[PDB]
């Protein structure tokens, strides 16, 4: 919190003010030429449209550029300032001397990829922490040996300078070794999985962030539309990261913890006890698959059908046959209800027409379509018992309820190869260890179609009744 820092901060604020002034003026003249081209333009309709669109793109680019224009700055060894940003600003008067570089330039490269052991020609690197137009603070990152640097947000420079150790080989002049290690991590060409297992006191997190910057610049063309997912143990640490995170130009990060891997809910680390160590393990998959089969309950008592003449047709044979065939397609549970119903209805219509309707003495044009159709339909509409019966056998269910109907019953649990240390009173005191079991379950159960159709239908006729209902 020195004074030289205030001097520098004010200087940089003045410079960015000048940049924003030029940006304001270019927006001004661009809106002016835009209005003009819109009114007359003199020329032809196609030239008019082209000029209109071009000036609109200029307006949009500048409008966006207003939000964090200058990322930072470079001081080279020949003492030539460079200012990096999301917009190129040149002076048309002094032969287009760069006042602000675009980060996508072959000359703003020693800002993502430069280290303290393999710099390019640089002596320093600054980052600026902006809100929308204001330079709150900045941090230097000297690419070499520091002595004391006013503000860094990690103080790395004053620690890298107070290294007091016995003379000798001395691990090759302590600083150089650290710098070369970091360089090896960052300038590495694997574009796959890297592990930086180090320890305390070595800056592994900052190194990882510089690594991510190097990668997101180098391969900014496969990424830049995907993101950077950064998980962590606590939102305090995540805000710390977000606060000393390099550019990631034109990309965006997504911060997370184990606990918010799910869309919507943010577990506050309830930390189910050590027996849940069997949840942080892949065997649990079986359990899920075995707890998602105990939901295909088999009828013990025969379910009564009352289609005005027909006897109860579904029973252990029918339900068993249908559950087996539904498990015999290799796809999720809520999409398998389809085959269950297809089979039950098949064997309750084709095998009830030739018995209860009248019987035999017609092999076509009555058995094939007519009684077929009547039985089919009378069954498809029985949303009271037939469908309640199915929902009793093949329930359309969801991840948020299986863990609850499993962690409590103590019988469904035993029917899943599951142990008994995972039983708890409340089935929705969701912990950290049962989050990945909710993301794994949406892929075993999947998503039906019928229910979604009916639901969006009702939703449509609910958004149409509130305002005016004539939709057709």
């Amino acid at each position: 919190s020195g004074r030289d820092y205030e001097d520098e901060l004010q200087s940089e604020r003045d410079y960015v003010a000048g940049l924003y002034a030029r940006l304001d003026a270019e927006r001004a003249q661009s809106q002016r030429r835009y209005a003009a081209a819109l009114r007359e333009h003199g020329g032809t309709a196609v030239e008019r449209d082209a000029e209109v669109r071009a000036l609109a793109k200029d307006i949009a680019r500048l409008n966006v550029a207003d939000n964090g224009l200058c990322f930072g700055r470079l001081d080279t060894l020949d003492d030539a300032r460079l200012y990096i940003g999301r917009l190129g600003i040149f002076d048309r008067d002094n032969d287009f001397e760069p006042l602000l570089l675009d980060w996508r330039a072959p000359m703003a490269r020693p800002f993502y990829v430069a280290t303290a052991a393999n710099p390019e020609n640089m002596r320093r690197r600054r980052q600026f922490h902006t809100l929308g137009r204001k330079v709150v603070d900045f941090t230097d990152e000297i690419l070499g040996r520091p002595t004391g640097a006013e503000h860094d947000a990690t103080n790395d420079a004053a620690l890298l300078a107070a290294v007091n150790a016995p003379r000798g080989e001395g691990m090759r002049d302590i600083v150089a070794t650290i710098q070369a290690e970091q360089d090896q991590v960052i300038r590495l060409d694997h574009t796959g999985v890297l592990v930086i297992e180090g320890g305390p006191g070595t800056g592994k997190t900052v190194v990882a962030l510089h690594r991510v910057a190097y990668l997101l610049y180098t391969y900014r063309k496969q990424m830049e539309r995907h993101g950077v997912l950064v998980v962590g143990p606590t939102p305090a640490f995540l805000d710390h990261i977000g606060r000393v995170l390099p550019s990631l130009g034109e990309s965006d990060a997504v911060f997370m913890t184990p606990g918010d891997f799910v869309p919507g809910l943010h577990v506050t680390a309830e930390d189910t006890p050590e027996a849940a160590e069997v949840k942080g393990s892949l065997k649990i998959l079986d359990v899920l698959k075995a707890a998602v089969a105990d939901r295909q309950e088999l009828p013990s008592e025969p379910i009564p059908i009352d289609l005005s003449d027909v006897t109860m047709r579904i029973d252990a044979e029918t339900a068993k046959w249908a559950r087996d065939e539904a498990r015999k397609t290799g796809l999720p549970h809520n999409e398998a209800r389809a085959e269950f119903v297809d089979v039950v209805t098949y064997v309750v219509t084709e095998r009830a027409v030739a018995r209860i309707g009248r019987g035999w003495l017609t092999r076509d044009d009555k058995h094939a379509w007519e009684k077929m159709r009547a039985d089919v339909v009378g069954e498809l509409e029985d949303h009271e018992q037939f469908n309640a019966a199915l929902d009793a056998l093949w329930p359309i269910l969801t991840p948020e309820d299986v863990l609850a109907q499993l962690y409590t019953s103590h019988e469904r649990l035993r029917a899943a190869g599951a142990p008994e240390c995972l039983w708890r009173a409340d089935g929705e005191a969701w912990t950290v260890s049962d989050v990945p079991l909710l993301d794994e379950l949406v892929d075993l159960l999947g998503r039906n179609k019928a229910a979604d159709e009916a639901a969006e239908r009702e939703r449509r006729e609910e958004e149409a009744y509130a305002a005016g209902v004539l939709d057709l």
Binding site: L38, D49, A467, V469
Partner: protein, 235 residues
Amino acid sequence: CYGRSMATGKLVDIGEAVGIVAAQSIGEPGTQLTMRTFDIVGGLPRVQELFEARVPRNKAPIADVAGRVRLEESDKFFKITIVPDDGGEEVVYDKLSKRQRLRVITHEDGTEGVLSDGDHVEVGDQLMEGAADPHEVLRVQGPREVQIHLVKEVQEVYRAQGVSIHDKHIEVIVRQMLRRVTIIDSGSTEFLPGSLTERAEFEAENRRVVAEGGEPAAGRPVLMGITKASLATDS
């Protein structure tokens, strides 16, 4: 109410078809307007976006209340909170993409610039640069102000592109776009709820009902488009 016919230069006559006149006066210069690539370019697309009461792409939120603003901003987001002047409940607009910058005012004097904290806000005022949503205006401000806003926007579009259309044509069409009500509480009337009833029939029905005139029919206006409003016809 119409005024003087522009052909005859005198007062309009009785039996003059003035809806077709407006239709044609708006259509004819349509080729003189910017178009879509075969909003950002506000030509025929914007006119189609208004006469059909469509939510815009660059929608801007308006003030449900008067009062002053507390402006917060974080990474890529604005959050405004309107502390009213009466002393009631403040409202908030939180997920405001900093892409849409703000509502610059450029006041007559002092060079206001952007909308800021501690500044004042009238009802129906716009906070973001862009294009308000007619239905919001309708519920907050009301039908008349809806109509006026729509005419202002259409004629802005045209003016910016060198076309002279007297606003009474826009007004005819708009009028026909806000010409109905959705009933809520039938009252003592021969009306169903959720139905679309023409405001004049509705007034005349809940007005002629004076016998036991202690609970008449209740209805709320609805903002339709020039294609639905042609489906919701009485013939």
